[PDB]
């Protein structure tokens, strides 16, 4: 694994241009490599024994798996040394996704709704990255709009591997109660009270379904109530549906495939990828250009 003592000072190799993100822990800046001018994202996090396992897990995931074109590509890691009365800071340096998150995009779109063709394109890109991780026995465990990013060219990249899981076998399971309630699968929530319950990669597929709804309706199901309430109604409520009858029958059938509550009747990542909403799609390059154009207009 990664050893935080071997990391060097970033000196004046990168300059922080502006703040672009604040998620769960630390802050992300637009970074600029001062010699070449190359842009990168720089996630800055105070080093602390309390946060160090989460920081190492994200760094190892990125080192091993971000070569895939749907994961933001890892460049390196530094540590800014600070005087004795001030915590040291880890700089995690990766590919800059210049257009922000999917959540960002939904916020700045009129009516907080994406065109279905953009939803289909984004979902397929998410599914491809997920497919890469699941083949490598990784569960992401935090799929949601905030952690799906867009490049300046409307390419899609997953980020945020802090709470992801590395399994040993294909069949291997996990039972850690973790995530954001609105996006959590029922079988993940079941690990709160049931010590014998477990889940696997299929939980990422549920979260993907909630993310498609988030893109279609501007928020996940149940976001009108506090997260405690939602945690206890997700297992009891019937699986969420799209409310508007105007979406295509394809998209409705896809949401139905993602959101099977009984996870052993939920299709695996590979069957879901052949779903006509994902498979029967116009050219990647054509849809991408339209989305790139809308991102630029609304900027």
């Amino acid at each position: 694994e990664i050893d935080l003592s071997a990391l060097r000072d970033p000196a004046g190799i990168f300059e922080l241009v502006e703040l672009v993100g604040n998620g769960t822990y630390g802050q992300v800046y637009k970074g600029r490599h001062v010699k070449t001018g190359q842009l990168a994202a720089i996630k800055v996090m105070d080093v602390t024994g309390d946060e160090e396992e989460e920081i190492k897990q994200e760094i190892n995931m990125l080192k091993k798996y971000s070569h895939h074109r749907n994961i933001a590509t890892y460049y390196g890691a530094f540590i800014k040394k600070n005087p004795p009365g001030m915590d040291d800071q880890l700089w995690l340096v990766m590919e800059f996704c210049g257009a922000g998150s999917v959540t960002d995009l939904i916020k700045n779109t009129k009516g907080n709704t994406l065109k279905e063709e953009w939803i289909a394109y984004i979902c397929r890109e998410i599914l491809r990255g997920l497919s890469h991780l699941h083949q490598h026995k990784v569960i992401h465990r935090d799929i949601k709009g905030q952690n799906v990013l867009l490049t300046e060219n409307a390419e899609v990249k997953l980020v945020d591997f802090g709470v992801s899981a590395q399994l040993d076998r294909t069949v291997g399971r996990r039972n850690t109660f973790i995530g954001t309630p609105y996006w959590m699968a029922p079988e993940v929530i079941a690990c709160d009270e049931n010590p014998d319950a477990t889940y696997d990669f299929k939980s990422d597929l549920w979260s993907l379904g909630i993310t498609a709804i988030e893109m279609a309706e501007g928020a996940p199901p149940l976001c009108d109530m506090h997260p405690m309430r939602a945690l206890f109604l997700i297992p009891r409520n019937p699986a969420p549906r799209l409310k508007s009858k105007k979406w295509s029958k394809k998209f409705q059938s896809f949401i139905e495939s993602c959101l099977v509550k009984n996870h052993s009747q939920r299709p695996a990542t590979e069957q879901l990828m052949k779903h006509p909403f994902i498979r029967d799609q116009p050219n990647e390059r054509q849809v991408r250009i339209q989305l790139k154009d809308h991102i630029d207009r609304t900027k």
């Binding site: 769960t24 954001t180 109530m225």
Partner: peptide
Amino acid sequence: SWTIRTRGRIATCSCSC
């Protein structure tokens, strides 16, 4: 709001209501 982390912690991070 919020998100569930390890060890009985939460943080601001997707929600509230």
